[PDB]
Structure 1
Amino acid sequence: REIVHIQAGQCGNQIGAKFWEIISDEHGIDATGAYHGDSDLQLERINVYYNEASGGKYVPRAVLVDLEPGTMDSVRSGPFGQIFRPDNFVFGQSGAGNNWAKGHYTEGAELVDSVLDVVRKEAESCDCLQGFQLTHSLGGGTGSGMGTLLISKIREEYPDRIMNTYSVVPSPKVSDTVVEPYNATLSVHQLVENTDETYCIDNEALYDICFRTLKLTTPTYGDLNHLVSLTMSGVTTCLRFPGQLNADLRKLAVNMVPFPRLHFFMPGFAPLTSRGSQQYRALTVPELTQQMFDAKNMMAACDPRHGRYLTVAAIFRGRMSMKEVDEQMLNIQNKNSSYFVEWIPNNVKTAVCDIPPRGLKMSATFIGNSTAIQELFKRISEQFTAMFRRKAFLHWYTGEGMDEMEFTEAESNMNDLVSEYQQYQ
């Protein structure tokens, strides 16, 4: 059970750069592939992201993508940049210029062969794998254009496995590009069918968490990428360390995705405390659980209180007590009986791992599938209906041959998706 890594676009790299910086510290690997750890538990399941090389060195199972050469120099020269194998850096030379049309048709058609040759190499090397995970942003041109293409090609080759995407969906309050709505609409037409587990993140809410809860005065992209990577590292703890109760990727998908189309999640992490207020807290499970479900700490631009949770999952880390976890699960459910779907008794999935995060006693991750995602989509599409109606900017995309059926199909199926969430709320 090991899983290969794909990461695309300019945005995907800084999200991808911090992941390999954090996870090397978790597993004891130095910046040059050496090992200096203490627990033998690090080496028990090391091959999940790493593969063995000569001389007692490990290099990651990373397949790195780009379409412009500028971002390559930064990642190569940065901290923990020499870990990657040089062949893995696959990048073009021209650029996308914030287009979905160029990212799928014109420039993605040529560079796609190079990456699929590498990902085919990573698949045969591993003995028995389960999934691929991809990190990208849903507002740009390369990440949306190339990311949607690879997902299509990968799915047809391996229909029997699980697939992961950790997307960033844009928000109007933090809007940055005049053509954002065209990018976000054209992509989601395919993630509705060609991925099994999808996580949505807003750059707007990341600013709320760093301002209010964490008391950060200068949120740079150094800090925002820190928050997301801790969520990715948390989902795959059961794959790498033992525990009283275990839950891997296939265990979550079956238990918490109720219907095939309803796979859009909301992250959430706890504890998140400031460096000055950390001396004024306890160390106990109750304080962790009450923080997960907080509408003020969830990691997207949605208030769950506008709807009712379908299913959730809470993943805990540290030496813990098994009553103190499940007993408090019912305290939330009965005391808050209004916010949970009535015809799904005991909506909560549970898991406990043993090895805690370094420097801490306890932590936890919340993955709650809610019906409040139905508001994220009309909020974006309303942006799009105000522009496409008057055919603004449309000539730039039409030069590559798309037809207005493509937009209507994009609009119709997104209405089809929005419809599916309302009745089952």
Structure 2
Amino acid sequence: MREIVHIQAGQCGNQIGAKFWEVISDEHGIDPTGSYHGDSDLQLERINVYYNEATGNKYVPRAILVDLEPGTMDSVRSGPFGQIFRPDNFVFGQSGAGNNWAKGHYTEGAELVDSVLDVVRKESESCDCLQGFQLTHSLGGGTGSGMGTLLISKIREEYPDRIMNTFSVMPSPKVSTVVEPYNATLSVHQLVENTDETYCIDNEALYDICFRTLKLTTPTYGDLNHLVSATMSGVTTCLRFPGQLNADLRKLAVNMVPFPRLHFFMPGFAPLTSRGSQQYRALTVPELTQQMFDSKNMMAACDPRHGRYLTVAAIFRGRMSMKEVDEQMLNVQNKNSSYFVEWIPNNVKTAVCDIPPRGLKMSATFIGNSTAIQELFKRISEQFTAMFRRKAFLHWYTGEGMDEMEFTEAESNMNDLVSEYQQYQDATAD
């Protein structure tokens, strides 16, 4: 369990994926040419997780950049850290998926998928001991949704003993494309069956944090991705720096996933700021710990107080008292006892990393498996029902090879998932 293979699909996948590399490359002390120009020994300790060592002492990301739209190829390559990526690892079509899931999962996507698998096989070969896979994509579009979930299924039949982890960004009417609930319902059906750990990044919550908390009147995707990049930086901290707590993908999955299907995590970050917001008043351990479960700091549009936490992983970053952290994590559980499942002893795990993120003296990242995530799936189900009830625009999908049963199967699975969440929220130790 050493190397992680990263795959980024579609518009959303490549944009949020690129910001992740720009962020962790700075954290690991890598410039856009792949040369290490840092100071800490800790920076290169677990560098082999996300990078390959080539040339002299040059580091290359173990990243595969996919899209059916070739436009994305130039966007990322001409970008800030576009020169670190392997040129043979860009797999781009000339076609496009026109926001149709069936186009990415059956027609246009199924043609390019084997050329992608050729590249995944290439990177899996120069892997001493592969941990697993990490996919960044959007569930609202066509490529990231359809092709991305085809990739997930195709990888899982070839590499089943490897962990499949995803960063799935949820579509929202606030942000965006009428058949987004179809693309999101059809992808959630694949994720419930083919991933081990999924981070539910909701565009509704992303907009709301910018709008309500950050006071950004009409935010761009650059403002939303500023929350996504900082979240991804914190949730992958455990894997990137030397430690004991959730050191690898499987160890994290073992602690966070009590039930096969209940593997969708409500991500969170503290403190929250706007891009280039001239920093003022550094946070303390109690202020960090309080912003923990604070609904206003969640990246998924759910209230934690509307459900119970099955399991929790908390990551504190910077120079701070371990006794302060341990004291504040115990109070947050005793002063919120009812919101933590009684039948799962020691469900909250804490980790402290001495390395803080870029621009922040101290930060705190939170990964929660709360039964309250059913609120997100209910919202997609309602949006889906209204359209599928009348069988509206169904022919755009069914025309591209798909069957109506596939819509009924995805709807059944997503309704079942919500009922499962509720069954454990209502479950007592007695």
Q: What TM-score comes out, normalization by structure 1 length?
A: 0.94
In structure 2, C-alpha distance between the alignment counterparts of 1:272 and 1:329, rounded to whole Å: 20
Are residues 55 and 105 of structure 1, via their aligned partners in 2, closer, same or farther at CA, if it must alter by over 3 Å? same
Are residues 274 and 133 of structure 1, via their aligned partners in 2, closer, same or farther at CA, if it must alter by over 3 Å? closer
Instruction: For residue 122 of structure 1, report the CA deviation from its aligned partner.
Output: 0.4
In structure 1, C-alpha distance between the alignment counterparts of 2:17 and 2:304, rounded to whole Å: 29
277-286 vs 141-150, which moves further: 277-286
- Kindly indicate whether the alpha-carbon contact (under 8 Å) linking 1:28 and 1:36 is maintained by their aligned counterparts in 2: yes
1:300 aligned partner: 300
- Kindly indicate whether the alpha-carbon contact (under 8 Å) linking 1:244 and 1:354 is maintained by their aligned counterparts in 2: no
- Kindly indicate whether the alpha-carbon contact (under 8 Å) linking 1:131 and 1:164 is maintained by their aligned counterparts in 2: yes
- Kindly indicate whether the alpha-carbon contact (under 8 Å) linking 2:200 and 2:265 is maintained by their aligned counterparts in 1: yes
261-270 vs 355-364, which moves further: 355-364
194-203 vs 348-357, which moves further: 348-357
Instruction: For residue 256 of structure 1, report the CA deviation from its aligned partner.
Output: 1.9
Instruction: For residue 420 of structure 1, report the CA deviation from its aligned partner.
Output: 0.7
Instruction: For residue 283 of structure 1, report the CA deviation from its aligned partner.
Output: 4.6
Post-superposition CA distance 1:57-103 (Å, at most 9, x none)? 22211111010111212111121211112111111111111211111
- Kindly indicate whether the alpha-carbon contact (under 8 Å) linking 1:246 and 1:353 is maintained by their aligned counterparts in 2: no
- Kindly indicate whether the alpha-carbon contact (under 8 Å) linking 2:175 and 2:207 is maintained by their aligned counterparts in 1: no
In structure 2, C-alpha distance between the alignment counterparts of 1:91 and 1:13, rounded to whole Å: 12
- Kindly indicate whether the alpha-carbon contact (under 8 Å) linking 2:8 and 2:64 is maintained by their aligned counterparts in 1: yes
In structure 2, C-alpha distance between the alignment counterparts of 1:96 and 1:343, rounded to whole Å: 45
What number of residue pairs does the alignment pair up?
Answer: 424
- Kindly indicate whether the alpha-carbon contact (under 8 Å) linking 2:271 and 2:283 is maintained by their aligned counterparts in 1: no
In structure 1, C-alpha distance between the alignment counterparts of 2:91 and 2:278, rounded to whole Å: 43
In structure 2, C-alpha distance between the alignment counterparts of 1:253 and 1:14, rounded to whole Å: 26
Are residues 273 and 376 of structure 1, via their aligned partners in 2, closer, same or farther at CA, if it must alter by over 3 Å? closer
Are residues 275 and 102 of structure 1, via their aligned partners in 2, closer, same or farther at CA, if it must alter by over 3 Å? closer
Instruction: For residue 418 of structure 1, report the CA deviation from its aligned partner.
Output: 1.6
Instruction: For residue 305 of structure 1, report the CA deviation from its aligned partner.
Output: 1.6
Aligned residue for 1:32, secondary structure, equals coil
Are residues 316 and 247 of structure 1, via their aligned partners in 2, closer, same or farther at CA, if it must alter by over 3 Å? farther
2:80 aligned partner: 79
1:325 aligned partner: 325
355-364 vs 241-250, which moves further: 241-250
Instruction: For residue 371 of structure 1, report the CA deviation from its aligned partner.
Output: 0.9
Are residues 170 and 130 of structure 1, via their aligned partners in 2, closer, same or farther at CA, if it must alter by over 3 Å? same
Are residues 319 and 251 of structure 1, via their aligned partners in 2, closer, same or farther at CA, if it must alter by over 3 Å? farther
- Kindly indicate whether the alpha-carbon contact (under 8 Å) linking 1:243 and 1:354 is maintained by their aligned counterparts in 2: no
Aligned residue for 2:367, secondary structure, equals strand
Are residues 283 and 169 of structure 1, via their aligned partners in 2, closer, same or farther at CA, if it must alter by over 3 Å? closer
Instruction: For residue 211 of structure 1, report the CA deviation from its aligned partner.
Output: 2.8
Is 1:98 aligned to residue 108 of structure 2? no
Are residues 392 and 81 of structure 1, via their aligned partners in 2, closer, same or farther at CA, if it must alter by over 3 Å? same
Q: How does 1:24-35 map to 2 (within 5 A)?
A: 24-35=25-36
Instruction: For residue 238 of structure 1, report the CA deviation from its aligned partner.
Output: 2.9
Is 1:23 aligned to residue 30 of structure 2? no
- Kindly indicate whether the alpha-carbon contact (under 8 Å) linking 2:46 and 2:242 is maintained by their aligned counterparts in 1: no
In structure 2, C-alpha distance between the alignment counterparts of 1:301 and 1:416, rounded to whole Å: 20
Instruction: For residue 138 of structure 1, report the CA deviation from its aligned partner.
Output: 0.1
Aligned residue for 2:309, secondary structure, equals coil
Aligned residue for 2:365, secondary structure, equals strand
The unaligned stretches of length 5 or more in structure 1 are none
Instruction: For residue 271 of structure 1, report the CA deviation from its aligned partner.
Output: 1.6
Are residues 245 and 88 of structure 1, via their aligned partners in 2, closer, same or farther at CA, if it must alter by over 3 Å? closer
Aligned residue for 2:130, secondary structure, equals coil
Post-superposition CA distance 1:284-306 (Å, at most 9, x none)? 21111001111111111111221
Are residues 377 and 246 of structure 1, via their aligned partners in 2, closer, same or farther at CA, if it must alter by over 3 Å? closer
- Kindly indicate whether the alpha-carbon contact (under 8 Å) linking 1:244 and 1:352 is maintained by their aligned counterparts in 2: no
The unaligned stretches of length 5 or more in structure 2 are 426-430
Are residues 119 and 406 of structure 1, via their aligned partners in 2, closer, same or farther at CA, if it must alter by over 3 Å? same
Instruction: For residue 351 of structure 1, report the CA deviation from its aligned partner.
Output: 1.2
Q: CA RMSD in A?
A: 2.1
- Kindly indicate whether the alpha-carbon contact (under 8 Å) linking 1:304 and 1:370 is maintained by their aligned counterparts in 2: yes
Are residues 134 and 351 of structure 1, via their aligned partners in 2, closer, same or farther at CA, if it must alter by over 3 Å? same
Are residues 37 and 149 of structure 1, via their aligned partners in 2, closer, same or farther at CA, if it must alter by over 3 Å? same
In structure 2, C-alpha distance between the alignment counterparts of 1:156 and 1:336, rounded to whole Å: 42
Are residues 258 and 281 of structure 1, via their aligned partners in 2, closer, same or farther at CA, if it must alter by over 3 Å? same
In structure 2, C-alpha distance between the alignment counterparts of 1:246 and 1:14, rounded to whole Å: 27
337-346 vs 87-96, which moves further: 337-346
Instruction: For residue 322 of structure 1, report the CA deviation from its aligned partner.
Output: 2.7
- Kindly indicate whether the alpha-carbon contact (under 8 Å) linking 1:8 and 1:134 is maintained by their aligned counterparts in 2: yes
Are residues 24 and 181 of structure 1, via their aligned partners in 2, closer, same or farther at CA, if it must alter by over 3 Å? same
Is 1:48 aligned to residue 49 of structure 2? yes
Instruction: For residue 282 of structure 1, report the CA deviation from its aligned partner.
Output: 5.2
Instruction: For residue 165 of structure 1, report the CA deviation from its aligned partner.
Output: 0.4
Instruction: For residue 249 of structure 1, report the CA deviation from its aligned partner.
Output: 2.5
In structure 1, C-alpha distance between the alignment counterparts of 2:387 and 2:45, rounded to whole Å: 55
- Kindly indicate whether the alpha-carbon contact (under 8 Å) linking 2:292 and 2:365 is maintained by their aligned counterparts in 1: yes
In structure 1, C-alpha distance between the alignment counterparts of 2:68 and 2:223, rounded to whole Å: 25
- Kindly indicate whether the alpha-carbon contact (under 8 Å) linking 1:163 and 1:197 is maintained by their aligned counterparts in 2: yes
In structure 2, C-alpha distance between the alignment counterparts of 1:338 and 1:38, rounded to whole Å: 45
Instruction: For residue 417 of structure 1, report the CA deviation from its aligned partner.
Output: 1.3
In structure 2, C-alpha distance between the alignment counterparts of 1:323 and 1:3, rounded to whole Å: 33
Aligned residue for 2:351, secondary structure, equals strand
